[PDB]
């Protein structure tokens, strides 16, 4: 798996309230947070079949 | 079913507003409530369908 | 068409602000409504075919 | 054209900031608006096809 | 590629909190931002696809 995929979920700065997916290491799977609208990092995902198949495994 | 369908729903800690199905074992079915964004219990759905399918 | 049909749209007391059709009986076709994402009464359809079908 | 799509649009009483489009005639073509959830007028589509299909 | 690429994002003046795309030149690609809900500049697509298809 990328190395992004072991990043922590990133809101950012703006104000939107976004559900994103996030792969945690920890538990195994991706899982939502609050995505702000700007300024994403990697590990974050529109469909969780992208953030499974990319970041899972 | 599963017993994960038999705890009420969670909405959790973030402070978005997003409508999810939870399974009502009461009532013997699906229902809706309001999630947070984060922090999700298993008896949470995206998609009413998986909800009756997999409480059912 | 059903009676419940006939009964006014329920926003409830949940905090979402989530678009959904009522059938409105005086008005003769479904309309939208704010649902709040909980406790929803039956005059109330994510999907406007559904409304009318249901309820037109 | 029908003579709704020559009307400003209605954002409405309610308090939703739902994506809609509206045909404006000076323009000459749809653009979005924000809908509040309750009471459209009928410059107001859910597509925008639709939109510039029925008043284009 | 065309000029308008090159605009940076417009939230314009209304109050909704929706994702659009916009094509960072400086970048290379498609990125969000959010959009008001009324007075779209051109750099600004409801799809991914479209955004780097247009611009990219």
């Not at 922590?8 to 991706?30: D, H, Q, V």
Request: charged residues 25%; positive net charge; glycine residues 10%.
């Amino acid at each position: 798996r990328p190395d992004f995929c072991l990043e922590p979920p990133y809101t950012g700065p703006c104000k939107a309230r976004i559900i994103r997916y996030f792969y945690n290491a920890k538990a195994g799977l991706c899982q939502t947070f609050v995505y702000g609208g700007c300024r994403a990092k990697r590990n974050n995902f529109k469909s969780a079949e992208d953030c499974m198949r990319t970041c899972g495994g």
